[PDB]
Amino acid sequence: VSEIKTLVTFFGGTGDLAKRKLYPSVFNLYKKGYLQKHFAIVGTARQALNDDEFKQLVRDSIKDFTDDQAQAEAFIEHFSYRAHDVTDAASYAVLKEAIEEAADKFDIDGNRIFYMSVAPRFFGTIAKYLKSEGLLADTGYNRLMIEKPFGTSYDTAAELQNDLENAFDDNQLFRIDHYLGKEMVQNIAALRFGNPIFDAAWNKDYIKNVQVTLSEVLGVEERAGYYDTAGALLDMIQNHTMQIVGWLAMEKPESFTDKDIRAAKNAAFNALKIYDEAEVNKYFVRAQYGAGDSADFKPYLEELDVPADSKNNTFIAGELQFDLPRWEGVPFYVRSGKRLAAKQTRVDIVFKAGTFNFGSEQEACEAVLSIIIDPKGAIELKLNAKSVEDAFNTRTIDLGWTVSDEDKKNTPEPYERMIHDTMNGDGSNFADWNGVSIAWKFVDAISAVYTADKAPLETYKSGSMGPEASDKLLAANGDAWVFKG
Amino acid sequence: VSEIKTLVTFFGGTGDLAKRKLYPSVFNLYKKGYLQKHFAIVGTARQALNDDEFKQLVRDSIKDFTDDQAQAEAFIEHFSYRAHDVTDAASYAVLKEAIEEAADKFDIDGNRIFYMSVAPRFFGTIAKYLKSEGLLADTGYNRLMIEKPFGTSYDTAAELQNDLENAFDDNQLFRIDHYLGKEMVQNIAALRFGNPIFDAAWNKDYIKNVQVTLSEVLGVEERAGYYDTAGALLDMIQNHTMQIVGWLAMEKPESFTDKDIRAAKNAAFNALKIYDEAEVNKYFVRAQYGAGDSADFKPYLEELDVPADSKNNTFIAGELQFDLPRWEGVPFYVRSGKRLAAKQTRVDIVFKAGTFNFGSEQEACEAVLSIIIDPKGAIELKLNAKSVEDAFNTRTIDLGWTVSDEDKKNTPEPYERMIHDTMNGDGSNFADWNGVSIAWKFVDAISAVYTADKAPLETYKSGSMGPEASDKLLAANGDAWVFKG
């Protein structure tokens, strides 16, 4: 395997995310031989720690992924640390030195990746200082990995993007969304473009509607302080759902290069209809979970730290419309919520029933292509066949496939995937500015109606698949949710 | 369920086929309530038996299918017998009387079915006498069920058809081919016409080749006397294979009525290319099984009653070409033989690989739709997806479906299916004259080269999937057999 020469600086290096996911992920890359000799990891945080102490922190972090001790130690030797306060310009000079020391000791020419595992309020500050204080490599590439979230509205996001563009180009910005780094989400384009029978049918002439579901069985839990201000709309719809939809609605790319994949996705994003107040009331649904089936399933208002006067949405369902020839009249249904019937992230593509008359009592129903992303990867194709009856009649059968145990074993964790893609400079599985800005405009229009309270707030029994207004939404076009729980 | 009013006369009524399959099958129809009051079964053979003795024969025949004794007896009471010699015109008067007695006792207006479970040499004789001696009902329908085989060449078949048409119309002739009465063979049209994504792809633009395999693991066995003169060509290709191919190659019918299904099939049969000597040598392969892996697997020449100088084909593989727009350049490969790697009747439809470039090391391969008919029904769809690797790459996955245990239980045996379809007058699953005549012309051309010996006779190791000339056949067009054993 080819060697990746890179210098990674982790802001928030002593953090929990770094300990649990970042370091073990960079370790796997080393285990696979991608990282060999010319690479260095510089950790940074406020806490005054020296190289040996930081090395021990990393040692304890990769412990549960160590088979060979010599290998673990050979890896840890590539780590260095430098205490540093992100708000103090002067302090960046100290980090600049540690970085240059690392590049020398391991002979690395530029190729710098900066990981911001810090509080969102510092994203712009750090980036601006990276340029003004000379921390950016003058040779090779300079890439930034910005953690969730990228703004809380279009305005804030636009301001962040504006700050980021002081030192970086959009193609150097790597926004983290672990849903895009998931193996099954990356199977969509392969299934579509790699098979002519599906490629040719991926349009208005064969597809009746596309459905995207992201259900969770858990409630707000201990995260009440944050969730009460975000809701399913910002926590699950704006980021995860919109980006999954991007893969489904994109045009057929000129090639499978990240540049063309993005152009193909943007053609769709640019054709998306932004809703006004009336349209939001007609095409979207917001709800809050109520009394469940047992005492443990308490309504959203009775959850701790939740303001008794909260009108927050723990569920969202809506219809998306794309003004492209390929999708004229094809509704894209999305839904996500807490306290639903089952943990599941899936895509259901309903094909139009055929008009061939068999003269049977049961005519041809709609074929369905389902791609289960969570909890276990699967692909199912529901087709029409003959029933086991004396007289000719149709019925539906499921052709199915599931990930093997070997598959699960070889599947890189999403963080390993994201780190690795950034080192390769592969923007394929990352949302670009255009995609994120449009996703914000769409949600802002809905959020505007919600904060103004010019739309009703539905309610649903915990453990169900949502309020009836959700089914009412699809019924208006003669559609129905494929996944019933 | 609606009541079927019919009078069935079984020529060869004391025969083994009648005891094992015919009577138990007519019994199931009674059990399902299709046959209730107005129906009668008249058995006939040379053996002098009276009504009580024949009733006992039937009693012993349906014994292993009896739960309720009262029901079994209520059924048997509908049977009558009359000894009768098929070559004696005078004798038909006696049968005519027994038939009229039956129609009176159970009040049946015509609706007669005549089953010829006799030696092939008597098919024409009986039919001619049925008309001249007045055994045909003057009211209702008159249908004939002719057992295998329908001729041994085009000439003989044409002569039989000519005799049969003295008393019947082609739509009244029901040629028995148990492969057409199989549940999975009837699923082909449902899968094709009931699903737009397959219907639209069922042509030269998406299909690269169609493959039809009918493999057996057994050898010639005790049937040497017959097989040595027929071979796989007449025993399996002419009848079973050609008719299965008919379902696959047919045009899309105007409706699912037997008349339109037949018109759609005939458009294809009429476009089939009849080969000359040169073409037979280029597009077909004949072989004989040799030494196996153990002492029990003896070569065809060492089988009992097999003439040491036999050039009989125990294997056939060939390419069919249809001169229709839908199949321009799409080869239809067929193969059938004894002593092969596995018992199996299947259809493999290879779709053209896509031309989309992922830039991967492994590009998109050909998707395959396989319909397993024997030994256990199944449908598999091999598609391209992403491999579980760090770099993007395609790989193939199998979406699969298999008949449930409930399905097997409710599936009517092929003889029940055929009897029932005849009572309904449904010619859908029956080969018509045009289809059979064309099937004969095609095989005659090949058989002509074989008897003249103007083509080589290949050989293959028993337990393999055939001689190398079989693979050579597909390789000429860049194809390969999907099922490797």
Share of residues in strands of chain A: 15-25%
Major sheet size, sense and barrel closure of chain A: 9 strands, mixed
Termini gap of chain A: 44 Å
Widest beta sheet: strand line-up of chain A: 14-13-12-11-7-10-9-8-15
Instruction: Supply the number of structural domains of chain A.
Output: 2
PDB class: oxidoreductase
Keywords: oxidoreductase, glucose metabolism
Assembly: dimeric
Entry title: active mutant (Q365->C) of glucose 6-phosphate dehydrogenase from leuconostoc mesenteroides
Characteristic terms for this protein:
glucose 6-phosphate 1-dehydrogenase, glucose metabolism, 35% helix, homodimer, globular, Dihydrodipicolinate Reductase, domain 2, Rossmann fold, dimeric, 15 helices, alpha/beta, 485 residues, oxidoreductase
